[PDB]
Design a protein around this ligand. Structure first.
Ligand code: ZN
Ligand code: ZN
Lengths: 694, 107, 174, 60, 146, 202, 290
RNA sequence: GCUG
DNA sequence: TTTTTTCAGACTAGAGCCGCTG
DNA sequence: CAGCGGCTCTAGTCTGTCCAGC
């Protein structure tokens, strides 16, 4: 199949390269903003019970700048760079506030201005032919994916974080294996930990002043009876025996019923707010509020039913105990456990805080003026201020400081100025990943090259110096996934035979045959036959019934099958080999070039598939057709795509020692060469141009 | 070993009554009189024996009219049986022959 | 050890075939630049890439990369690169060589910070010590750390014979 | 490029707070003889050179 | 000491710790034991797919889900045991696959509840339930055909 | 693979479709059955199905520590009041079982009374988990606390156990007027219509 | 020298396991005078250097053997009166390997084990084949204490130095005489230099703190000379001894070995600004004003 | 952020 | 009211602990 | 039967992590 190379240009026309930045903002401006507005929809005043301020639909418009009182003319990216203006668009929202006593509905009220990344759907440049670009004074060969804030082009660097909703088994400094699942939802993001500090299991959370012994938490949740707790965690002699010291701790105390455990947890809840909170929330009630929205929030109580939270808690306890025995702690360097967050996610978190601050400030204004100033009606629309939202985002992009106190997020260095030393310097900056651990000076940690990075992160492209492995660069053919709906994956799984977990006593989870199904971190049931769920789910995805980026993976050592549609996960395209023969078939490859098929047709015809790092652990990829065996499952589309944009420019990289290739990647960015066709028009702080480039 | 109450399913504790030792619940009246011998064996893992017998150890299992080894057809060989793990394992048989111009290890 | 033998024997053959006029050999024969390991790697075979003195560890479960069978202890699934730099490295071999190369680059950057902190700590404790006309190394306080420097009283730089001052056989010949 | 990396300072602007030279070529700068350089001079045994460099030619 | 109220050793199949002194079945074997070896009737529990391949008859609808509550009494299908232990539930033109569910070992009771009067009624225990069957669509054959 | 064995006919009965419940006891092993234990009451709410049962435990058997039974009964009930009392006698006579609801819908679950050569399905109205209730201790604290310092009406049911002839009688209503043979008018849809029904277009 | 390492490894002591940290990290350990060094290694000389049999017996004395290894079975026995966890002890493994253990020795070891079995309730039965630990006085004494004892009874060390864990016997390759020296990974130099058959006169360590405590200051000077000059020639990196003869002699001239940390500077220097120019500038200036 |  | 974003390290108090020490 | 001596123990806490150059 000589033209297996032709697939790299075709995947690249639609996705890949700098697209992973563009398609991400597009999801935030078109889908995530509305999910955030539904979550913080409705503001209610303490002074008047009747007053209500819901938000109905939020739209983000075309970028325009008004230089007069009411002109509202359109604006171009070049003019903003020259006049040091910000390229941004108005955020317009629809509300139905109480007003005097009616339900006045307003359509299209501006709440502020949103910074717009170039080449995004809302950007003017999109859909423009090269001749049209000349009038807009923008180079056609411009990567995009950057924001013009105050006349400086700024790029939000991709950040690598451990995956949310997934329990992480990790040793503490004491060598004490613990566990920690970060629950990220659309309402509350919180950290819930489990710890064995004296040979007995305690649960820790920031709303609880002291660590609570786990059996008390189980009794509060509603699994009263020691046998039911022991049956859920384990029935093997070792698992039960090790949870034996922990049983005594509740027995020593007198907790034996839900009420006596809920009250104990309440006497420990931090009650920080004693002012403006009115009178309410008894100690027992505060506990039933915490156990139902604060602890393990990703799992959802139906009607104050913790049957689901209790099983998930048992799975965490069992994982600590098996790990404590053999000391097989999960690696936090494996790229399967790490999800990269690009602009959309960072912007959505920043917007979520600013929308809640704007809503809060409107309630505080309403509570102060509604009951005192006058019978004259309080109209929120007059007091609403555009500045809080506009100023907040711009400042975060202009200065790279992500200080969000609500989520305890204090990260600086999120945004950098786009480097215009050369065209390559700009393209490389777009595909740049920033690590989570940045102060680590241990050589064999994040700084090392991990085999899991194969095909996802360029092996040789890294800065030499303070950040030898801290900063990484994406390879050519890599797609970072975006969040999907999950309605179909839940349905296919039930019909595929996955029995519910509410209908079984926990003893099943310890039988060797039963395996647990997890979707984005929430249990969907228990299936006896792992292979049929895995080989049916793949067959369905190939026909296109299920989304291409959903990934099914199975871990035999811990009997669980994981289905992931979360987003932020690196995915690489691979040809499917069935019966020792590649599926491209030569004729299809000619059809791509001729025009009958595009890359999407190959994906839904079962010719090509996307595999994430977890799925790759279950596959036996063969780099070349000659290396095909009986066990081989897939074939690599092109070997050279393993290297990245900077690495590729080196001729014959394979024939050189590897440190030399790393130096070239850094030097190529520092070279002096043509920047763009609009280079003469631009008036940047420093521009270096070779007089006669070749 | 964990044993649980048939009534409420809390964990039992052993205590002493006026006539017998009892398994007793902490939360309900249920007690169970220990009338006869009851036991629970752990069977832990013993040490490795592989490098312990090599190099002319103090073996003793040889007896009169013992079989000759199969290669040399002479009785110039020792043989022994040992548990490799805990004593619930069925004992394995092993033997080593040492003769002039002849070194071998067999099973 | 066996993988090491293959590289050593391949290197010996490469040196024997090389003419007495190869620029790389001449630089190795004098010590101007290079070594015979560098020439062997370029012309014959680059060796097993070693991370922390051991074969590449398994990033995936029971497998270094998804391109080899699980639980494979075979050479080449654990970092042995048969090809020379001149022949070129196959994609899996290139990744293993990059992993070993990065370990060195990370080590140098981390090591420079550690040695610098250490030098400040040593120079902030030994700076006051100085030899005196009485021949006794003493502290600023006047406490005697030593009665003669290095027992002999000799200075390390002036030695011409591996910690011994004269090297008499050479002196008589001159 | 060497043209942009060439800096020399004799007597020039001194910072108001410490009366020591500036830290930037743009500000006329002045080079920092740091502790490691100072340690090498102590090893050489040059008492006068350290006094001239760190007091007279900096902030006497 | 009462022999029928011994303390519960934790694995429920292994309840007997004190005394007077398993492998996994498959759906072909389960149906064979209850036909040839023992003629006794037994209550099996089977979970069917969320939608059966039917139309709600005259039920005033929209392609809504079809359940056993919507159909009418009578023969609903045929159950085939094949060679090599494959079991199929042919429930129309389509064949659904049948597999053994999680092996429960806690007690399960099948009971009637009838509120025959406004405030009182009858509760009746019809029998114990031992085995669970799972019915699922054969997505490979359904899709391969079209 | 021809159907060499057991082509079994499958029927369907609706006579108990609004009456049949599956009760399950997560902490009680399959060998220890409540068939012998006398049941004293059954309570249900027919909507928001929450069944409660009370079972009598004897006191002349050796497994009852009467010394402790007198103490726990004295904690729960005031020494001689007896107008409202959990236990009539001076000992703990009864264990109460409280239900938790497993699932909101039960449309896809069916009980299957196997007989030789045929299978009879019947829809389930509910699946409930029965657990031993621990209220007796919460009330014992409430009557210790005082010394120191819902719209749905209950339905009462008579309990007929597995030994009673009413159980052998009503077990026949799980069968349906046996049909010799037919192809159902419903469940006629084709494989391609069925695949599009379980996997709807986005 | 520390700046110029190529960071090569190949430093396992030639046993192909238990690599010794040997680079600038080892130089940091020797200079800091840490009481705990990672990779502590007492090299011992046997009284008889040619007998593998003698080496095997001596290794048994130095290394720690847990009760569970030597115990055939371990049963918690509940009886109508008195529940006791009785450990069954094998008498063939005790003979198969030459370990001098008995029920009376085990009974002594079970007490003074931190298992709270300090009372004489623990008893010996039969012929070194059964030891019975009945229960404890308090702290959830019922069957709870018993559950802890059953899990923690196998861990008790019947014989051998608790601190040492991983003694390995190394054979020299010299053709004329083949000799065995056992290198123990552990820290109790006093015990490992007294066990019968280890010739104390030639046993040595790599922890200056362990040597200083057991063999005077002057031997602690010679290890600071040696273990720096051992780790400096291991990394190439030749150095004069007269530099190390000064660094050791500064480090141990005020009584005890004063490691060059922030803390060792306070015990070496009297002047404040020399301490104040080093770390802890706040406390060292206020305390010298006090 | 990069050069040293 | 709601996450973490390095890795040790050799000091400084308490909490006991058990046993002789009177 | 009672007490204070040292223990001994876990965590606690503050303290660093190359030079500079733009
Ligand atoms: Zn009980
Ligand atoms: Zn022989």
């Amino acid at each position: 199949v000589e033209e297996k190379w032709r697939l790299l240009p075709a995947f690249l026309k639609v996705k890949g390269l700098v697209k992973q930045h563009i398609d991400s903002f597009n999801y935030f401006i078109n889908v995530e903003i509305k999910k955030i507005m539904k979550a913080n929809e409705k503001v209610t005043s303490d002074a008047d019970p009747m007053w209500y301020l819901k938000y109905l639909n939020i739209y983000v418009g075309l970028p325009d700048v008004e230089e007069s009182f009411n002109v509202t003319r359109p604006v171009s990216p070049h003019e903003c760079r020259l006049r040091d203006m910000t390229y941004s668009a108005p955020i317009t929202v629809d509300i139905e506030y109480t007003r005097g006593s009616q339900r006045i509905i307003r359509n299209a009220l501006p709440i502020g201005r949103m910074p717009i990344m170039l080449r995004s759907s809302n950007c003017v440049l999109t859909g423009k032919t090269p001749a049209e670009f000349a009038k807009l004074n923008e180079c056609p060969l411009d990567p995009g994916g950057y924001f013009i804030v105050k006349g400086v082009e700024k790029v939000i660097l991709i950040q690598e974080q451990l995956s949310k909703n997934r329990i992480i088994v990790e040793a503490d400094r004491k060598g004490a294996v613990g566990a920690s699942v970060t629950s990220s939802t659309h309402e509350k993001k919180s950290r819930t930990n489990m710890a064995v500090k004296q040979g007995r299991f305690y649960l820790r959370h920031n709303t609880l002043s002291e660590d609570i012994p786990i059996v008390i938490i189980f009794k509060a949740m509603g699994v009263e009876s020691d046998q039911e707790i022991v049956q859920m965690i384990g029935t093997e002699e070792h698992v039960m025996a090790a949870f034996g010291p922990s049983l005594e701790e509740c027995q020593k105390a007198q907790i034996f019923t839900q009420m006596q455990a809920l009250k104990y947890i309440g006497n420990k809840v931090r009650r920080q707010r004693m002012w403006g909170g009115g009178p309410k929330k008894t100690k027992i009630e505060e506990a039933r509020e915490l156990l139902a929205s604060t602890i393990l929030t990703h799992v959802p109580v139906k009607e104050f039913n913790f049957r689901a939270k209790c099983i998930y808690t048992a799975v965490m306890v069992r994982r600590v105990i098996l790990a404590q025995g053999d000391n097989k702690v999960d690696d936090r360097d494996y790229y399967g456990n790490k999800r990269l967050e690009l602009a959309g996610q960072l912007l959505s978190l920043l917007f979520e805080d600013l929308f809640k601050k704007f809503n809060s400030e409107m309630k505080k204004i309403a509570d102060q003026v509604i009951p005192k100033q006058r019978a004259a009606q309080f109209d929120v629309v007059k007091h609403m201020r555009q500045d809080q939202i506009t100023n907040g985002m711009v400042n975060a992009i202009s200065t790279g400081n992500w200080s969000l106190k609500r989520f305890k997020m204090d990260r600086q260095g999120v945004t950098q100025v786009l480097s215009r030393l050369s065209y390559i310097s700009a393209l490389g900056m777009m595909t740049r990943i920033s690590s989570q651990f940045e102060k680590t000076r241990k050589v064999s940690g994040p700084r090392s090259l991990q085999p899991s990075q194969w095909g996802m992160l360029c092996p040789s492209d890294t800065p030499e110096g303070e950040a030898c492995g801290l900063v990484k660069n994406l390879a050519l053919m890599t797609h970072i996934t975006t969040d999907m709906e999950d309605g179909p994956i839940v349905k296919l799984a039930s019909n595929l035979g996955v029995e519910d977990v509410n209908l079984l006593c926990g003893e099943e989870l310890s039988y060797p045959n039963v395996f647990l199904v997890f979707l984005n971190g929430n249990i969907l049931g228990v299936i006896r036959d792992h292979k049929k769920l895995v080989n049916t789910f793949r067959l369905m995805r190939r026909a296109g019934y299920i989304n291409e980026f959903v990934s099914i993976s199975t871990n035999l050592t811990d009997r669980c099958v994981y289905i992931s549609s979360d987003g932020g996960r690196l995915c690489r395209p691979y040809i499917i080999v069935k019966k020792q023969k590649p599926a491209v078939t030569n004729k299809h490859m000619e059809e791509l070039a001729q025009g009958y098929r595009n890359f999407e047709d190959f994906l839904h015809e079962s010719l090509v598939e996307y595999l994430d790092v977890n799925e790759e652990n279950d596959c036996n990829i063969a780099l070349y057709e000659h290396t095909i065996n009986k066990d081989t499952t897939h074939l690599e589309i092109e070997p050279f795509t393993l290297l990245g944009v900077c690495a590729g420019l080196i001729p014959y990289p394979h024939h050189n020692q590897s440190p030399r290739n790393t130096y070239q990647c850094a030097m190529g960015k520092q070279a002096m060469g043509t920047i763009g066709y609009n280079q003469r028009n631009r008036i940047d702080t420093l521009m270096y141009l070779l007089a006669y480039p070749q | 070993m964990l044993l649980f109450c048939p009534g409420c399913g809390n964990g039992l504790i052993v205590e002493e009554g006026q006539r017998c030792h009892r398994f007793a619940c902490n939360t309900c009246p249920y007690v169970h009189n220990i009338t006869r011998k009851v036991t629970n064996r752990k069977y832990p893992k013993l040490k490795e024996v592989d490098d312990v017998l090599g190099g002319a150890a103090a073996w003793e299992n040889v007896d009169s009219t013992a079989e000759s080894c199969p290669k040399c057809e002479h009785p110039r060989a020792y043989f022994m049986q040992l548990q490799t793990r805990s004593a619930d394992e069925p004992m394995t048989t092993f033997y080593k022959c040492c003769n002039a111009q002849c070194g071998h290890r067999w099973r | 050890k066996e993988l090491s033998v293959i590289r050593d024997h391949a290197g010996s053959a490469c040196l024997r075939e090389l003419d007495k006029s190869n620029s790389p050999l001449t630089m190795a024969l004098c010590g101007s630049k290079g070594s015979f390991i560098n020439i062997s790697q370029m012309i014959a075979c680059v060796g097993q890439q070693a991370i922390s003195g051991s074969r590449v560890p398994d990033g995936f479960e029971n497998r270094s990369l998804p391109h080899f069978e699980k639980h494979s202890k075979l050479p080449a699934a654990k970092g042995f690169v048969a090809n020379s730099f001149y022949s070129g490295l196959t994609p899996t071999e290139f990744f293993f060589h990059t992993m070993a190369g990065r370990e060195g680059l990370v080590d140098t950057a981390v090591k420079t910070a550690e040695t610098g902190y250490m030098q400040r700590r040593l120079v902030k404790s030994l700076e006051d010590l100085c030899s005196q006309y009485d021949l006794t190394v003493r502290s600023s306080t006047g406490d005697i750390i030593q009665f003669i420097y290095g027992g002999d009283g000799l200075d390390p730089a002036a030695m011409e014979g591996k910690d011994e001052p004269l090297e008499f056989k050479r002196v008589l010949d001159n | 490029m060497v043209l942009d990396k060439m800096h020399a300072r004799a007597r020039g602007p001194r910072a108001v707070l410490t009366r020591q030279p500036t830290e930037g070529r743009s500000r006329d700068g002045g080079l920092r003889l740091g502790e490691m350089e100072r340690d090498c001079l102590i090893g050489y045994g040059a008492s006068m050179l350290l006094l001239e460099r760190l007091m007279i030619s900096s902030d006497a | 000491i009462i022999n029928i109220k011994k303390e519960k050793r934790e694995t429920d199949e292994e309840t007997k710790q004190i005394l007077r002194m398993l492998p996994k079945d498959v759906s072909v074997a389960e149906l064979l034991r209850e036909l040839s070896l023992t003629k006794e009737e037994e209550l099996l529990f089977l979970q069917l797919p969320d939608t059966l391949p039917g139309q709600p008859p005259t039920q005033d609808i929209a392609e809504n889900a079809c359940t056993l509550a919507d159909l009418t009494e009578g023969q609903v299908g045929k159950l085939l045991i094949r060679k090599s232990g494959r079991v199929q539930l042919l429930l129309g033109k389509v064949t659904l696959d049948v597999t053994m569910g999680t092996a429960c070992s806690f007690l399960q009771e099948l009971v009637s509840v009838g509120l025959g009067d406004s405030r009182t009624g009858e509760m009746t225990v019809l029998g114990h339930v031992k085995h669970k069957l799972v019915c699922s669509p054969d997505f490979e054959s359904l899709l391969d055909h079209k | 693979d021809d159907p060499v064995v057991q082509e079994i006919d499958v029927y369907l009965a609706k006579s108990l479709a609004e009456k049949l419940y599956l009760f399950q006891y997560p902490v009680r092993p399959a060998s220890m059955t409540y068939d012998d234990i006398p049941h004293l009451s059954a309570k249900i709410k027919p909507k928001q199905q929450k069944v409660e049962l009370e079972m009598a435990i004897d006191t002349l058997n050796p497994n009852y520590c009467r010394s402790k039974g007198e103490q726990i009964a004295l904690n729960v009930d005031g020494a001689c009041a007896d107008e409202t009392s959990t236990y009539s006698s001076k000992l703990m006579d009864k264990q109460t079982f409280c239900s938790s609801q497993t699932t909101s819908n039960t449309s896809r679950y069916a009980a299957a009374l196997y007989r030789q050569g045929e299978l009879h399905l019947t829809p389930l109205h509910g699946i409930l988990q029965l657990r031993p209730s621990f209220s007796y201790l919460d009330k014992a604290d409430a009557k210790h606390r005082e010394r120191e310092a819902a719209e749905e009406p209950w339905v009462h049911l008579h309990y007929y156990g597995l030994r009673d002839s009413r159980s052998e009688h009503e077990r026949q209503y799980l069968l349906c007027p046996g049909s010799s043979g037919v192809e159902n008018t419903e469940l006629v849809k084709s494989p391609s219509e069925y695949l599009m029904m379980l996997m709807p277009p986005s | 020298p520390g700046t110029q390492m190529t960071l090569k490894t190949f430093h396992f002591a030639g046993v192909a396991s238990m690599n010794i940290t040997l680079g600038v990290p080892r130089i940091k350990e020797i200079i800091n005078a840490s009481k705990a060094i990672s990779t502590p290694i007492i090299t011992a000389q046997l009284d008889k250097d040619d007998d593998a049999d003698y080496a095997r017996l001596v290794k048994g004395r130095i290394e720690k053997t847990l009760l569970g290894e030597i115990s055939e079975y371990i049963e918690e026995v509940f009886l109508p009166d008195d529940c006791f966890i009785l450990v069954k002890l094998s008498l063939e493994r005790i003979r198969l390997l030459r370990l001098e253990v008995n029920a009376e020795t085990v009974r002594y070891s079970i007490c003074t084990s931190k298992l709270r079995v300090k009372p004489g309730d623990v008893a010996v039965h039969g012929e070194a084949v059964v030891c019975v630990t009945p229960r404890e006085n308090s702290k959830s004494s019922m069957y709870y204490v018993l559950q802890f004892l059953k899990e923690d009874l196998p861990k008790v060390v019947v014989q051998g130095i608790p601190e040492v864990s991983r003694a390995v016997i190394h054979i020299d390759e010299q053709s004329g005489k083949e000799k065995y020296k056992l290198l123990v990974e552990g820290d109790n130099l006093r015990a490992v230099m007294a066990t019968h058959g280890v010739k104390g006169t030639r046993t040595t360590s790599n922890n200056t703190y362990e040597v200083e405590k057991t063999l005077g200051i002057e031997a602690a000077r010679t290890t600071i000379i040696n273990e720096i000059q051992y780790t400096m020639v291991n990394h190439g990196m030749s150095i004069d001894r007269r530099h190390v003869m000064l660094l050791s002699d500064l480090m141990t001239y005020k009584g005890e070995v004063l490691g060059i940390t922030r803390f060792g500077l306070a015990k070496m220097k009297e002047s404040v600004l020399m301490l104040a120019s080093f770390e802890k500038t706040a406390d060292h200036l206020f305390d010298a004003a006090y």
